[PDB]
Design a protein around this ligand. Structure first.
Ligand code: NI
Length: 341
């Protein structure tokens, strides 16, 4: 049965609630982004209206075969009316097509659902600036002070410099990047760009990336692995056995692999700067774990909430244990007391 934190009070709406069957008294189903924990349960047999971004709608049509008559894409940053309620979709700075949802209830309550997000000060100048928010449904994935990570920009700098150096030293090295869902495309695209290569991948993954509008994508990606020196593989194959096997498959075109595994967080961040990251090496295979996050760090989240000053916070992540929930509620109290709301 659908949890309370996926239900929007005073509406017939749910958010990211497709794995519960027919939710009682739900007239419109919103989807914040195309990740499996959120879309779990959509298919060609779905016949309720689905409201989402254009990119997320492209993916529903093409990857899940949801019928076009049930897909209701909305433009971003635009006041729209759904079943008589004013709504706005805002950029969530997560994966391609990911949104936050602003709801303007008939009685005057204003509700922000972040979906999955990485808070950024640029959000302090969207349609959020213009009015008060009574309730915030907050992505609390990394809601603890140990979660510190660098900007995406520093992480990409590190990756580009590392790959450029390795291939300059050895023109027969192959670079591999791991993936398991849309998101984090900049990692592999920035590397390919500095090396003067396209990124090679499976037909299925290429199809997925074509659904995303990215400009100049016919330009950066390909299914011809032979002509590419940046290959994309499933995250599961990013280990020494998987990569030795892949290397065998390339037919003596390459003699070394440098592989990247973009991860959310790893406790090396407690003791180490990005500059100081080193790989795991075995034979002619090196694996770098890099902290490329598409969720807010603790401090980024804190800042966003102390700016917004919501009257009530409802966590959507880490809600399954009493110790987690209690920990989060203690932080929310601190933030409020420090900011004076
Ligand atoms: Ni997500």
């Amino acid at each position: 049965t659908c949890p309370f934190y996926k239900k929007i009070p005073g509406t017939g709406f749910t958010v990211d609630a497709f794995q519960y069957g027919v939710v009682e008294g739900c007239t419109a189903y919103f989807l914040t982004h195309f990740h499996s924990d959120h879309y779990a349960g959509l298919s060609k047999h779905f016949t309720f209206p689905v409201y989402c971004s254009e990119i997320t709608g492209n993916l529903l049509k093409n990857k899940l075969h949801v019928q076009e008559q049930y897909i209701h894409p909305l433009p971003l940053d635009t006041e729209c009316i759904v079943n008589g309620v004013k709504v706005v979709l805002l950029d969530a700075n997560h994966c391609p097509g990911a949104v936050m949802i602003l709801f303007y209830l008939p009685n005057g309550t204003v509700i922000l659902h972040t979906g999955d997000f990485r808070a950024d000060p640029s959000m302090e100048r969207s349609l959020l600036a213009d009015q008060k928010v009574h309730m915030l449904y907050l992505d609390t994935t990394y809601c603890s002070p140990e979660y510190t990570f660098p900007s995406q920009q520093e992480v990409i700098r590190f990756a580009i410099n590392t790959a450029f150096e390795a291939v300059t030293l050895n023109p027969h090295a192959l670079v591999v990047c791991g993936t398991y869902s849309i998101g984090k495309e900049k990692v592999f695209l920035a590397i390919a760009d500095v090396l003067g290569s396209k990124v090679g991948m499976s037909q299925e993954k290429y199809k997925t990336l074509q659904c995303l509008n990215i400009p100049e994508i016919n330009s950066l990606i390909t299914t011809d692995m032979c002509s590419s020196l940046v290959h994309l593989l499933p995250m599961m194959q990013i280990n020494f056995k998987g990569l030795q096997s892949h290397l065998k498959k390339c037919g003596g075109k390459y003699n070394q692999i440098l592989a990247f595994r973009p991860t959310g967080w790893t406790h090396s961040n407690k003791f180490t700067r990005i500059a100081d990251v080193i790989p795991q090496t075995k034979g002619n295979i090196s694996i770098y774990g890099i902290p490329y996050s598409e969720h807010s760090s603790y401090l980024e989240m804190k800042r966003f909430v102390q700016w917004l000053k919501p009257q009530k916070i409802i966590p959507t992540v880490n809600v399954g244990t009493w110790k987690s929930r209690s920990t989060m509620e203690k932080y929310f109290r601190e933030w409020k007391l420090e900011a004076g709301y």
